[PDB]
DNA sequence: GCGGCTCGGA
DNA sequence: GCTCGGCTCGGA
């Protein structure tokens, strides 16, 4: 029962952007930055095509959010991403000072929001970013499993 | 290989003065691959409305365009300031070979100070670290920006 | 040594 | 794994 402007509502737009990365032969990850139930930034992985090692879905949304906000600080915003953020994106989330990150499926190998580490809730950091996970995880995992050529029942098998 | 660390750090300090002229954090970075400059950068986050426009990110982005590849193997990144969590993570994704910074970020540094994400176990890539290159001149720029005495920083 | 310190929500 | 390798792009 997904209501408009719910976590699943925004995650489905983020999943629609992940299909764009899939069509572009990239890692099928999409991201949507939401502030007061309004989209201020969208993005998907374009690193291979743009020759940008930082062109992850979360970065493309944060850069767009800063332009839309005319401010490199994006307080009280919520970032939706289909994949658990890496160290790069989680570190960028701290600098933009967003309010929460909502991701779908986990990166059990190198995830930096609970999996390999938790840089967002690291002690000593200038800002703490709240974490919500599991939103449409089955649909986010299906996209990446087909990209990485893996059956779904092996992606994060220890959590199942 | 060819040039010395102080040679390239002198170039990175020149770029940090450009960020200083732009009323930004005076941090500059130069990306070197096979003793040739493939990327330059300085902090431009306030002017570009970019939360990621750190010196290292702008230098790495430029390197990816020059190399037409989002992977920048065997390159060495020079920066006047210890990389943050965001910038250190970008070096892992770019798969650079070494990061050389001058002064340390004792508060939130992610290359030895607050943490070491470059040498974290479990990561796909390990980035070597060299520090202290022209540390006095890198610290002077940030101390004057942060309005702090030199004998307090670190 | 403006406030309080690694941009001003450091 | 109506079987590409080896698994969280192919230097995963
Ligand atoms: Zn990322
Ligand atoms: Zn940085």
Author numbering:
A (entry chain B): 2 to 161
B (entry chain A): 4 to 157
Sentences from the paper on this structure:
To confer the favorable attributes of ABEs upon a CBE, we envisioned transforming TadA into an enzyme capable of robust cytidine deamination and subsequently generated an improved class of CBEs that uses TadA instead of a naturally occurring cytidine deaminase. Here we describe the development of two families of base editors, CABE-Ts and CBE-Ts, which use variants of TadA to catalyze the deamination of cytosines with either retention (CABE-Ts) or loss (CBE-Ts) of adenine deamination. To illuminate how amino acid substitutions identified from directed evolution affect TADAC’s substrate tolerance, we determined crystal structures of TadA*8.20 from ABE8.20-m13, the template used to evolve CABE-T1, and TADAC-1 variants from CABE-T1 reported here. Through X-ray crystallography, we show how the accumulation of substitutions impacts the shape of the active site cavity and may contribute to the accommodation of cytosine as substrate and the subsequent shift in specificity toward C-to-U deamination.
Crystal structures of TadA*8.20 and TADAC-1.17 were determined in a complex with ssDNA substrate containing the adenine transition-state analog 2-deoxy-8-azanebularine (d8Az). These two structures are highly similar, and the four TADAC-1.17 substitutions (T17A, A48G, S82T and A142E) derived from evolution do not drastically alter substrate tolerance by changing the protein structure or the ssDNA binding mode. We hypothesize that the T82 side chain near the catalytic E59 residue (~4 Å) in the active site may have a role in increasing cytosine deamination by modulating proton transfer to or from E59. Additionally, the hydrogen bonding between E142 and R153 may modulate ssDNA binding by stabilizing the α6-helix, as exemplified by the interactions between F156 and dT(8) in the TADAC-1.17 structure.
